[model samples]
Target: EGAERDAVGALFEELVREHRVTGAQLSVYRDGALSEYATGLASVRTGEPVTPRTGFPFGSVTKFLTAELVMQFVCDGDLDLDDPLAGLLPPLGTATVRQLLSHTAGVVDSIEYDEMRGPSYRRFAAACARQPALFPPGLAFSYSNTGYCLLGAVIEAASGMDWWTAMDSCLLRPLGIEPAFLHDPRPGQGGAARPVAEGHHMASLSLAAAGGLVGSATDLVTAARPHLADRKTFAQHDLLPEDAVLAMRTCVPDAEPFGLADGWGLGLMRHGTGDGAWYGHDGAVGGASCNLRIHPDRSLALALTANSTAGPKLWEALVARLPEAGLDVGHYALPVPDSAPLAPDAGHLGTYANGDLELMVTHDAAGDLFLTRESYSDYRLSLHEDDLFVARSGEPGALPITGRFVREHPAGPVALLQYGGRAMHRL
Candidate 1:
């Protein structure tokens, strides 16, 4: 254990330098034993050291907990997975709870951070209802935080309680966990109830049921550790039914993950498959990134959180070092082939847009393909397969970007670009 701790600690130090991470907390737990490693500053301006109890913004990882809450209603005969939102929020069309949880629901991501600065479930639901569906429900996977927000609405409707209150009463309090939902201390306020890491950039209220939860690395590990085992082995305090637990781990058929993993189940992202599989999710917002991976077969769960854009890059490094630390955690080994650079078909170069996101694909004078988004600098794209490309910015420990191009019409040009679980139409 000492050797493992030293190795992980050394790696965290290296990651801080290489990835420009301000601070991070990593918790690795197996069975009943757990070890935590922390380094760097929780607040760069304040010069605070990251600690096990430091609350980090946990972006979309909040989805799994929300999904579990919905499943509780399902198990208790209060709701049906196949039920349509037409009854709840009439304007949302025919989206179902299953579709929403799986990212197979065609909900539009209409809530932009700039426009939304606080929690308002009713307001967000109206915005979602106004926008057209990205695709037919359950037809494809397009990561939609909007879908989760609506699930929050469903929770409210079924429980006669608002989202956060219901979540607290039914989930957190019983588990002996205190959660920080939404932005804590609300910009310029002092004396927050607990220690919360300041994000690299200010956290937004745009991601309410979707990404608005804050907790520690240990908090996540404790909540997720039990679910890492078979449902039959769950304790009396298990928040979900045995069947609901199994359903959360079961992948929805034909629901392709835009990026995050091989597939998604209920709220959990399926990484790898079969005997070597691990179930978990990754989250990023306001330059903070958090990841949770539960390896059921190994009875291990790992949680990592960091206040930096490069947090995902650090996760890759930790994954690479797991085996060396005497842990056989499931690996999602990205395919890195040593092949000659290949250019995408000339017809593929174009501009695509979906809501606030716009993807521009171009070819330079040197025949190099490039991808550019308004939010970030352009990066070159290298072909990994036909209609598929990988983009890596020239930075140490940068996360690779993978995207696929497809034709919306059989006889039409490639009119759609799918990347990061978003399906953008060519403009």
Candidate 2:
């Protein structure tokens, strides 16, 4: 155990230093013990040490908790999973609750920050209602924060309370967890008096419902405990029925997660394959990245939060070191570049857009593929197989970006580029 702790500690220290992170909090639940670790500053400006109580943004990982709340409504018969939003939010156009939860609603990927922060969930839903659907409902999988925001509105309409209030009463309060949100506190919720970590980037009100929860690593692990349990274990502390939990884990057959994971369930990303399945979700917004995973086979839940854009890389490193503690949480399959340089397909070269994000795929005279983003320098692309490719930088220790190009038709031109769960269509 000492060796295991030492190895993990060393890796964590190296990660913080190498990634230049502000701070991070990690909580691990395994073998009947809950262990917590903290390092770096919660506020680089204040030089505050990140403690067990320091709340960090969970980003989209809040979707798992929010999904559970929505399922609670389902179990109570207040909302049906198949209930269509067409009547309440007509512009949603037959998008059902289940479709929204599963990202099969075909809603646009996200809303603008201005649209999100302007008004109530009603306003946000209305704004989302105005955007065109990415595809026909249930035809393809596209990660949609807009869909979850719509779910927030549905929760409001069904519960006769605000979505956050419903979450407090139905979800957090029942589990003995305190409710928190990003940006300023709610009207009656007081100011940000709690020891919350300052994100390297500014917080936005737009993330509410979709990725706006704030809590410590320990708090998140406690919240995830029941969801990670086996049937017998779940029966002891069932928040929703076993069936609802099962529903959340059941992946929609027609939906593919693109490059995000093996599959997408109601609110969770289904990691690993078949029998070695691990259920979890990851969240990222500019300066912060948070992740949670339930290794059901191992009866373990891991929660990690870092105030850095490089947090994903840090989490990846931590996963690599899990074997030191005698755990084999499955690894993601990354595409490797061939030794011989391969040119990207001419059909794939073009500009794609998803709201504020724009991806430009261009080729050099030497037949090398390169990707250009507005804020970042162009990175060389190396073809792996089929339309799948990996983007790498010339710099040492840069993280590789993996994604696949999709055509409207199999023999058609590349029409969509999906990477990091966001889809950009060829413009």
Candidate 3:
């Protein structure tokens, strides 16, 4: 090992201790090998140390795996990205596979209610299909779970198997990996399997394709390897072809990916740009947070999994130290706002809605701006620039989220409120 290896390990532990990570694993794949490091307990209640094999719920990181499954069909010529889903998933008529993959299908995420959970992936796609599309298909990007669920359904029709079975048999098992989900009795694993960590009691098939798979930090990186782009093409692979991987890494220009990333690809996310551009996705569910990143220039892929929601802070510190590994990988940075507030103007103050989701902007007696969302707490808005605001929920250690208002022109009325990859139209 070189000094780079030593540097990476040192910084990982440093961040873990500084952030008080309860249990976590760090896996970095470079130079044809994977080096893993683990710290703390897999379960504080049980008092056991976490091993590299400890399976942690990956949340939306599972979307990458689902994306690969779709890519499998693409590679095999069984399905095409632009093929309309009308026949396969009728509830989502005219929505193409590419639109669903890039989250340009305009479907609002409506799987929030308990009643929306379906016993079968097919039924779930139908049940949650009624949420009105935020805009026409392929018009813009808005991250969506409902769209991926329909993808899971599409995977079923194309493969003649359930969503879970197709993923495990076609993509995971072939690659020497195990298929794990939020709960037992999933399509392949027989039944009632317990996750390695705790706090995964809530479960749903509807969300499984959206964000369900759970595995080790190593498993995450292993799943990410097939998608890593090689110079001009990809390393020879059986599971996925070069074109498929390229499609996932190529950014869909014109997507206002404010809250998502600098650029959004089909199934993958592009961070940074040009020679320094990195690609991957981040995930969270309950207390667990997981991240997978790829440095294209170096063919480097790394993954971090933690048992605490605060894993993001640890991940950020780790990202900063990646240069020590000889790879400079950075994500898109939001504009830094003034510590002081900008007076809330009338154009930026209003109600905005995307399906059932809503945001209300108002000012207090002090004339400070705040945004209130339906069923959530208040977020005080700090102006980053005109029509753009940074929101903080006042939760300790929670990073500020940025949002921007859209106007017809410089002095035009606000047409929409864009935040967290969603465009909530003025209501």
Candidate 4:
């Protein structure tokens, strides 16, 4: 374990040397203790030293915290995982708390990849509000920032406190994290508030809870330690219930890791391979990337945060270096067949329940078939070989969903689906 640990540390240093990153913060745990490292220049322009005290924008990783807050409410009997989103949001049509966390709610996303959509956040939000749902809730899983933005709102309603206040009180304060950014740039210049290193976006305030969470690396580890560390040890007094944690870990139907639906636990991803499940989440943006993994068997929590926008490659590199951490390094192709018979009609069109995510299938005006989900959406369906289908974009060369129609139907065809990281049943 010592040799393996040294190799992992060396690999992280190599990332700094190769990527020319401004700085990085890394923490690893084995047998329940923390092994930490911080190094590199803080900024290309400033020549400041990078320390564990330095803060970085956490992008989508903030959603992990949001998920935990929502799940806390769920454990307290304030929210229902099975309730349709329409009932909770009322104005957003139909979605659920589960969809919001997992990115399966068909809420129009506030961000666009390319020039695919118009420019400006207002345009993006308006487009999402006007655009037909990518698919009905729970039918298919598509990541949606619009969903999480709303989730922040829901967190406030359920917690009976403002979003920032709830996080500060329920999560940050308890975790001994202060001066950490939770989507507030003009946090009113006060105590327990500090400025973050900025460069990723044209402006700093644009990245809010949906993606923006600025805080020191040390603060982050401290704040998330409860979820990252072993429950038997690190937990101060169980901020969230055990059953709620279990529910949050339940896989999102019709979703996958990075693309497929896995499971979304309250502020963590119930991630896993065929073996079982892991508690963690990975995040990325232009100027930064991060990965936080808590191995189930070992109860080891490992986290990486960097001030270089190496994107997903940073995650790939970190995993490659930490073989002892049980991260699969070798890459392989998804063996899908060239052609397979399609399901004529399937029974999974009504409502299929697999813990948190609920799959609901329906038909549209053109008599076309579609799937709706809570945390994500399915605007188009692309069939791969071997009877599998990935929900695709109306355009080309985007993140293709890893799902399939388990059975076809006359209304179209009821297709069984799998994405994120969980199983889906056709209604």
Candidate 5:
């Protein structure tokens, strides 16, 4: 653990120097105990030193809290994870807690995927609500900001309080976290106007449920501990059931493994690189990037908050160092070993004839497998998970995908994967 800790410190120090990271904070928990450290300044211009207390915008990590609150409503019997969100807000489709958590709700955004900021988002929401779903509910997994917005609406409707009040009462108060107001209706608050994240563009407000919250790295970590900690805490509600969560954690069947083949839990992400399940989420805002990782077995959590847009790069570096916390970093880079047995035959490789589409299952020269749309092989291919597969591109990561490679199905061969009340088969 000591050697690993030193390595992490060294890597982070290297990151600070390389990225010109204005400010950042880091925390680690081992066996439910936290070992946190921070460095640099919160802002270079202000000379405010970055401490464990310095805050930064949480980006989509806010989904962790949102999922928790949604689970709370489910526990109270006010809402259901499988409930369709038709009448609540915009009828993008019948959204459910599972879909919102996994980002497959397919709600039509008022704007395109590129438009991720501003109060004008209200206009976007109105537009989105009126339009039909971009895809059918839960048909496929495409990250949608509108999906999470509908989740926020679910929280509003189920709890009968505005979004802010419910979040404050349920999530913030219990965790002792004070998230900077997002789209603050009042002035002088963190989200008001000035003195907040300097990227004051009109589009910033569009990040409401998707990536709207402003917080320091420290505050973000502290607020996130409950969700990221792995134990049953106040924040564990929206986790779906154990089986459901595991189902969500497994890779979406037949879908390409996007960046390490991560599966989506209710608002959480199952990183395929790590052990048992490496749970975390990544977010990119205007000039920032953030990541939070929770190891359920060790009850250890790690987070990185960066002022610059290099959050993904920094997150990659940080995760590379995380397995050092009492895990084998040499043989396996992540807490979980993403070693899956490859089916060494092309006999069953071609399209299996699913009703709607023909999924291309092919193997590369290295004998590693891959998949793509029958028409768009070049653009849609996702790699099979090999060690450090995603860190470097152009590698063989997926095998000739056996439709049975992953699923919620216990009895049958094709696994039933449903998020947001929709299902996708893995073949």
Candidate 6:
């Protein structure tokens, strides 16, 4: 264990330097014992050093908390997993409570609505009712931020409180965590509750249910520890009910999250699979990156928060290094490891889209395929097989991006372009 601690520290130090991360905090727990570490500047401009207690904005990772919040209503019998929201948000709303939590709701994945920052569930629901779902409920997984916005509405409509209050009074405080929103501290918040994140120039107050929390790595790990295998903590301490806790990590079948996760649970993400798999969620907002790794099999959990544009880069390296420290964080490894690159497929040359963004697959003069998007340099796309690829930005030290194409059948048209847990329709 001592050697592992040293290894973890060594690896953390090495990667932050290599990635040039601004500031970060990390926590690890094995066998109920804990280790914490921090480095870099919380604000390079302010010259404040990073601390373990400093809050970092945890983007979509807020989904995990929102999922728990939704389940609390379920425990009270106010909501049912199979309930169709039953006239909650209508016009085109049809997904059940379970579908929304699991990203199977097929909700429209757009945030470009007017009431996003209003803090009014009624208005938010009205805004949501205006958009059409990408597909029918329970048909696919598309990782919806807007879906969670409506979840905040459900919490508010059901609880008779506004979106923020319901989350603050019911979920966070009960867990003994002081409320930390994306941009500011909760009123009357004290003693390190102030938002310590630096990139305030890039934050928000939208239906923050999706990605509007500020907290330290310690807080995340502590919240996650109760969900670990020896979760008698629910009884010994104030935590979510056991059944609700179990439901959060229970994998929804055929709900493949592609490059992001092997399986999507209600809230937690199943990384890798079976005994070697770790569970957690990743979050990004502005320059911050946050992630939690819950390993039930080994009774270990890790949480990290970093404040920098380079945060994700550091995390990718950190995830790779964790295995050396015996953490064994899992990933859905590529099918053909170390396989030779294949010739470019002409069928892949076209435009693929998701929401407002577009992806272009075209060939360069060198006969190497390239992926182009607006305002970014081309990523050299190495065809691994018919649909699998490694898209490299041709930059040294940058991680290669992996993705696969989706066809209706073995030889049917490539209807959807799936890469990294998201789907872009081939238009």
| lDDT of the candidates, in the order given | 0.76, 0.77, 0.77, 0.58, 0.55, 0.76
TM-score computed on alpha carbons, candidate 3: 0.86
Clashes of each: 0, 0, 0, 63, 29, 0
Ranking 1 against 5 by TM-score, winner = 1
CA lDDT, candidate 4, residue 219: 58
User: What's the CA error at residue 185 for candidate 2, in Å?
Assistant: 6.2
- Candidate 3 lDDT, tens digit per residue, 276-315? 8888888887778889888755768888998876788888
Q: What is the C-alpha RMSD of each candidate to the true structure, in Å?
A: 4.4, 3.8, 3.6, 8.3, 8.2, 3.8
Model 6 agreement with the true structure over 256-289: per-residue lDDT tens digits: 7777777888888887767887789998887888
lDDT of 4: 0.58
Find the 10 residues in a row with the least total lDDT in model 1: 183-192
Error of 1 at 192 (Å): 7.0
- Tens-digit lDDT string for candidate 1 (117-202): 54346666767776766667866788888788888888877777767777777876776667686653233334546677877422
TM-score of each: 0.82, 0.84, 0.86, 0.71, 0.66, 0.84
TM-score of 2: 0.84
**Residue 193 error for model 2, in Å?**
2.8
TM-score of 5: 0.66
Candidate 5 residue runs with Cα over 4 Å from true position = 1-7, 90-93, 109-125, 186-203, 217-260, 273-276, 323-427
Per-residue lDDT of candidate 2, residues 376-405 (tens digit) = 867898765666778887766667788777
Residue pairs in candidate 3 whose N, alpha carbon or C atoms collide under 3 angstroms? none
- Model 6 stretches astray by more than 4 angstroms: 114-117, 184-195, 200-202, 234-238, 334-352, 359-402, 405-414
Predicted candidate 5 versus true structure: per-residue lDDT over 157-222, tens digit per residue? 677775666777776666666656556532333333323443212134545666666665555555
Leading candidate by TM-score: 3
Worst 10 residues of 5 by lDDT: 384-393
lDDT of 6: 0.76
